[PDB]
Ligand binder design. Sequence first.
Ligand SMILES: [Ca+2]
Ligand SMILES: [Ca+2]
Ligand SMILES: [Ca+2]
Ligand SMILES: [Ca+2]
Ligand SMILES: [Ca+2]
Ligand SMILES: [Ca+2]
Ligand SMILES: [Ca+2]
Ligand SMILES: [Ca+2]
Ligand SMILES: [Ca+2]
Ligand SMILES: [Ca+2]
Ligand SMILES: [Ca+2]
Ligand SMILES: [Ca+2]
Lengths: 141, 141, 141, 141, 343, 343, 343, 343
Amino acid sequence: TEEQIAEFKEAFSLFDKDGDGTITTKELGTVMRSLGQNPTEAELQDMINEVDADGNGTIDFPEFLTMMARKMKDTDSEEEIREAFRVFDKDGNGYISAAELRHVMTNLGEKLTDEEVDEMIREADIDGDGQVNYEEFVQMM
Amino acid sequence: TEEQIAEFKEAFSLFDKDGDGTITTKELGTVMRSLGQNPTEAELQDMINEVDADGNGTIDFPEFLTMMARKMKDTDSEEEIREAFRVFDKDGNGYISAAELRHVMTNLGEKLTDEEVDEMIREADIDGDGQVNYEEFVQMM
Amino acid sequence: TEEQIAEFKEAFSLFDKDGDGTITTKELGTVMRSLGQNPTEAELQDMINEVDADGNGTIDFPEFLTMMARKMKDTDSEEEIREAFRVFDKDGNGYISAAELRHVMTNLGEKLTDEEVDEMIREADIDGDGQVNYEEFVQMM
Amino acid sequence: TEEQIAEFKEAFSLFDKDGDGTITTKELGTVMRSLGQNPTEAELQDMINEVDADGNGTIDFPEFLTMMARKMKDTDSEEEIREAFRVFDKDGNGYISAAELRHVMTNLGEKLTDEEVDEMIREADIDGDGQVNYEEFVQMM
Amino acid sequence: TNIQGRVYNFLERPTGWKCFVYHFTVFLIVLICLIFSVLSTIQQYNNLATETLFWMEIVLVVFFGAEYVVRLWSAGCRSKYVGVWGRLRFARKPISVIDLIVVVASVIVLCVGSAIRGIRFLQILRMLHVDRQGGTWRLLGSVVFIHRQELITTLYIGFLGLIFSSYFVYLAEKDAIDSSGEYQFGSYADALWWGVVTVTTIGYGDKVPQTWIGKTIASCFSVFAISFFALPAGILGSGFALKVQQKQRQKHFNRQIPAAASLIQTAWRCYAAENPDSATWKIEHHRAAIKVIRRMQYFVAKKKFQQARKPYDVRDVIEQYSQGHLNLMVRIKELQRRLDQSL
Amino acid sequence: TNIQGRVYNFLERPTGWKCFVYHFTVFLIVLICLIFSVLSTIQQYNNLATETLFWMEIVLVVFFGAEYVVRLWSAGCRSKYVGVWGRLRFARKPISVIDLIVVVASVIVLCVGSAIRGIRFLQILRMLHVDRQGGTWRLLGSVVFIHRQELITTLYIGFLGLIFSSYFVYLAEKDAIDSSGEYQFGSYADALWWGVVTVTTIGYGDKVPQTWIGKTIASCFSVFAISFFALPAGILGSGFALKVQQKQRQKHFNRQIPAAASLIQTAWRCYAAENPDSATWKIEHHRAAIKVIRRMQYFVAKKKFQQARKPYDVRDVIEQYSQGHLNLMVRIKELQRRLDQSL
Amino acid sequence: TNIQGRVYNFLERPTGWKCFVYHFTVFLIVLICLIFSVLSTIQQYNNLATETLFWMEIVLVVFFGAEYVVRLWSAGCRSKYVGVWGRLRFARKPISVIDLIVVVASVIVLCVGSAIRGIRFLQILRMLHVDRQGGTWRLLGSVVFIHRQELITTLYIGFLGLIFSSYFVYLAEKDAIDSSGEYQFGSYADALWWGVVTVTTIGYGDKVPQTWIGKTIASCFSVFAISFFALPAGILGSGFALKVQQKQRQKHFNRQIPAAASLIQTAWRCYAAENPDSATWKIEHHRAAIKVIRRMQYFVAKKKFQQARKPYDVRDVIEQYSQGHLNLMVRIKELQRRLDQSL
Amino acid sequence: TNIQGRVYNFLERPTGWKCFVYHFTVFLIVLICLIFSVLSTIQQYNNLATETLFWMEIVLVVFFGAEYVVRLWSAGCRSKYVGVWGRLRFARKPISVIDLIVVVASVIVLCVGSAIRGIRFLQILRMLHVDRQGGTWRLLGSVVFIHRQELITTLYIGFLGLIFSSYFVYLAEKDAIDSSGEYQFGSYADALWWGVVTVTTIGYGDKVPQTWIGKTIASCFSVFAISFFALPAGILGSGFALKVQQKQRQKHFNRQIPAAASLIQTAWRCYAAENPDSATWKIEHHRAAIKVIRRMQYFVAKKKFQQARKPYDVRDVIEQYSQGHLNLMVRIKELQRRLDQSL
Ligand SMILES: [Ca+2]
Ligand SMILES: [Ca+2]
Ligand SMILES: [Ca+2]
Ligand SMILES: [Ca+2]
Ligand SMILES: [Ca+2]
Ligand SMILES: [Ca+2]
Ligand SMILES: [Ca+2]
Ligand SMILES: [Ca+2]
Ligand SMILES: [Ca+2]
Ligand SMILES: [Ca+2]
Ligand SMILES: [Ca+2]
Ligand SMILES: [Ca+2]
């Protein structure tokens, strides 16, 4: 994992904005601004909190490493996603309307762009039918 | 129900104040101002919350339709009203003083105008006695 | 009770500061200022809340009457006072140090003036001993 | 204990900043400033609250005396410290990495200076091994 | 005059001292009657008691009839029960019906008559009279409804276990005769009965598993089954306790008032909305908008009323905080605007 | 001197080590006496024990008398019990009364005397001595009071069920003779007894339903009845647990002080109000207004005190928030005014 | 067409009126069958019932087979069960498996055949059919899992106590013969059995301690043991009650939606992140940073979703307050800055 | 090397899979041994089993000895147990002591020896080995401690009731001979025993009240007594449930860290304070003041740590709110001052 760790370190350094090696919220905000999303302070705080191992308002390098470590496509993670999907799925089946899904993506939550939604749809619905299998999609992910 | 739906759509459009077809609180406030009631922001928020199906601070057209759908004079609704009436009814009977009722209407809660109160009284007390049957009134409603 | 009611009405009228016959907090504050105590708004609110029957931020005349009605030297009331006294009484007996009592009066809670405290002491300690019988005092009250 | 009490009184007098003999938060803040730590008002409030017997936002002389009275190296106190130590101790043993300890001292909580940390380390690790016995240290304290 | 109302209060829904005393007396009388009936039932005190019963029972029935009549008369206090139809409706209520049944049956018995078979049953029934207004039963029912999901499950699984255990015991102890010279588990019915007894934890001991295997199975299938059967008692008790706790932290009754009033007002407004040339049309498109607004207000009001009715909770607190916070934010924004405006 | 007070503490309401030890010793002695009495009761150890009892019992009674006397003497510590009247009042208290009864009765027995019938009863009574200050009973009583509404209901409905079940069993098993050659349910009383046993879940098995129909009815009417009878135990336990939990999150005692003081002050002010030429008239219409204000303050104070007394709750939190929020709003308003004023 | 889905709904996971009725009917039929079996089991009604059973049982099995087939057909409604593999997976589920076992076994019995030994067992098994979707068992299981730590302990300690008590009783009553002329505690096994009975609180009374010492030991070791054995029933009940209470103060379903959506979106974003030339790369070092940010967002989203799923709690309230407060502080700071900037 | 630590983990405080399996195996072995002992106890399987026991028991004891030795060796992992004294201290712990007793006793038995009286007892004792680290008992103990006030009361009052009931039954049924020709309540001891049985709800039925008066008294004094005796089981269960619920809403472990660190730092500072020429004297009267300040800080820190340790509660929320609110107020005041200053 040496190469991976080096990469992570590099990433951290570019993020950090200082020689202290301790990520404040301010640094994160700056980074976000550089991208151009323009996030709220509360949001930033929330982001840091999840990451933070010590729970002291500052992301340590070990903390960062820990967050990197826990991988997606773990079964526990998948369950939550499935539950979420179910929440939007009428008719209590592994099936949702494609158009409806698109609409939801456009509107509810952290809004997703039209192109992105189209891409998602393409990824999901291999068949021409709009009734898309969310379970399958989740598995693929 | 096609005609009804059309009517509802028309209403929504006149309310909306924009081509987005998504009612914010601001739009509602504007509408209120146009009438001339001059409501508080909190009140507006409360109003939207009850309506909102998705629960995202914005009234969708489907949400609006849903609110229209659930009709008054349903038995569940009636019970609440009866309970409320009881709350103001001394002597644990289906009877309240007309004068007292009038006073309450004038003073407590979302104040009701004198003329309106008079009208209400007329509607309720068919007989000349002030001891008005609230249950009967509720049934009529 | 006719005379009593008349007196109460008179009192209310002098308090009211207006023809509405509905005491707001502002009126109460004004009255307080006239005396010269200079109270906090929160305090005023608290005062009104206890009084208020309807619980609508305004003291009705009936509410006022109700408050007048419930008399001191009722047994329930006495118990609370006794409990309070006990709270300050060391040695788990119906006895407290006179000096200590004086000190408490001077310092803790709604401060009591020196003269007043002296008067209180005189009222309580008939005997020359400082160990004053609080129960007896309560009974007298 | 007469001498001790005299000393305490002297200390109180120097702290007090006034002839009232009643320590407000403001006085405490002033004292802190004189030292030069520059504390937050909330912190000051917290400090007073723990001390305060009556619980009235003011430290009485008796209260002060009481706080002085309860001595460290009482068994109850020790347990808490041990628990705290355990919280930072990996491998569920009476052993922690010296370097790690130093790091924690530098970073987490009320930050401790480098020299101070060094001193602490010296006090603790009599032996040359970094795996320091925290229980022993606690006992010594 | 308020006399009818007073009478009603005395009879049904009483918090009076005198009324309470009367009720207690009635209860005592009923108990005495029951005792007498019991005494009569045993052979040693049959001849002496019958005459007494005859003397007393008729009187009691007359009294009850009178009471019933009075209650019926008093129904006019409540506007729910007015006229003949109202009275009929009142009568329809369960306790009243029961009372009627008791009285008429008693009368019939008297007519038939001094031996009586159904009189004992009537006496037993009578004890139910005292629980007026359904205040005893209703609470219990509510609690059951609240905890039905779990209770039902417990009943089911436990039942299943009992069945299985019974079957196993039958399989075990079919051939094994007792020491007294009689087959304890001849039929499956017997086994079932035994199982029921065991789960109940009565333990009569008329039947006990004779075989070692049977004993083992009993040991295995007892404990769990016992626990399951005890569950309802536990769970219900817990529920009751929780309810009591909730009651202890109820809202004040004065807080319910304004919300209720508001709700009423909104309802009235809504009603008016349909009537075109009414007084409430004061202060086409506009009208439509107003209607919608009124409906919204009504909805809000209902919610508020419901909240008022409910006890204090964390959700309520959160809501309150939100309400405060938004207001504060708005104020701050206004201030900011003012500052900007000035410059 | 503080000696009387110390004595009182030692005797009644003790948290002392020595006192505790003494109490334990007393309890042990009582237990021993009880054991001896029990032994005497059986025929095999009657002749040897009587003499011992005679020797010891008198001594014990003397000791108890002495203790009682000491307690009486010590009453002067508490200002509630001063002089002769105070002492009499103290004596009136239940435990003390019981003790008195025990001692006098014992003395009477001794005078009469070495056989004794009432001595056994006295011994039994004696065991109640140790629960001093009513700390055991009082808590229980409080809990019962808190959960009475439900408990009573459970008692009632269950009782009714029991009655009904008994009746049904009587109806079933009147004619059916047992295998031993004796009618199990000859009387309704017997049936009732059986029912009671069954609901209790003792299951002696002296009586068991013989008929199949009877058995069926028992099966039907058992389970529910059993649950009902178990309810009190459950519910009370739950209540106790809840109480314990509440206690665990109590307020600190220092927070009660200031409120209490305030209350006291307000009471004093109110008292003064009646006296026209008093010192509290410092700082006609005006006087009247002041009186009203004082009363209001008193009312507030009482409420505050009550709140302090109670444990932490969501309602309290909400109140706190409201208090904060209003203050903040006021401050903001003031700021706004200042800004406006400047411009 | 939606017919398959409808069929599925009717069969499994039904909230329909008609469906409910059907289920009830089925249950009733099963009960009747069980009753018939029981009747057959006793010797007096064996010859008359067998023929009836033969007539009916086959029909019942056919019906059940048909139902099973229909259920299998309907599996295509759910996308979890599609094709042959999906159907197989569905079949694998426990209830379905049980049903299959019942049907095949019944068929086998019929083939063998009008006496039948296993048919009784099959009947017993059948009663489990009605608890569809595992809604009964699952809840119970969950509760057990929640309260396992304590429950297990109770089981253990109680068991230990029982063992010890049994041993002590064996030691006591080895030599002591009963009044009937038979050794009650000949073996340790017997003693163990007795202990089990006693702890259960069945109290058959086939075995009772004869020696005084034995009796004493029973008295000592009973009460505590009894309490321990009752614990599971109590604790589980309490847990159930608590769960019910929690359910009563659940969040609204509309609040879950947006969070869920957000989570989904974040997941999608994360997925995109791996694909270099995708549409989601809109709005090397920079890319890396973006990836990290997306991951962070996802983590946040998951947490939010979890919170939404959970019921209302003090922690949630605190979080909300914090969120509000920080925002307010920021606003204030901004205002201050503006003021400073102007001057 | 970390091998010793690993060994310790495997033996005591294991969360390992392999370790768990090993433990299970051990438990199974113990159970088997117990079963064998039981079998030996009954006369029919004595001659065949003894030899087997001899063969196996010695081996088992050797194994246990080895295990003990290993555990002792592993104590060096924990710094609490270092050297010889540390090891001795470790041994002193209860479970270890028990194990030692078992092994030595077994050895003694072997030496004496293939009959053995104490071996059975040793086997029984052995079952306690599996509950390592006291995780089973400790929790229970804690719960008992928490609910002692009420539990004790229940034990007391119930006991008293039992006594009284027994006495009354003795008074009732002294003269009354049974149908079998033997006095059921000859001694008061017998009566007491009966009472105990009844309250327990075992209901052996060896003794039953014969007189009608006696029966009546039993009926009266049963129900309440039964409820009281059931209370402990209920209450404890409720407590357990509550504890579980509390656990469910625990704080995150990361929140405890900083507070703990702070506490540690404050302690260190305090320690330094005594040493005059130390490094911590950086940044006479002044010194004194500093000491006081440090002590205050320490006190604060301790409180904070305690709060962190505890679960979430309304009090905590209130505190948080207060903290926020004060800060906000201060900020507002500062702003106001600035505004004033400018003008
Ligand atoms: Ca940095
Ligand atoms: Ca960190
Ligand atoms: Ca598709
Ligand atoms: Ca719009
Ligand atoms: Ca919406
Ligand atoms: Ca009328
Ligand atoms: Ca006015
Ligand atoms: Ca009012
Ligand atoms: Ca005096
Ligand atoms: Ca000062
Ligand atoms: Ca103070
Ligand atoms: Ca070292």
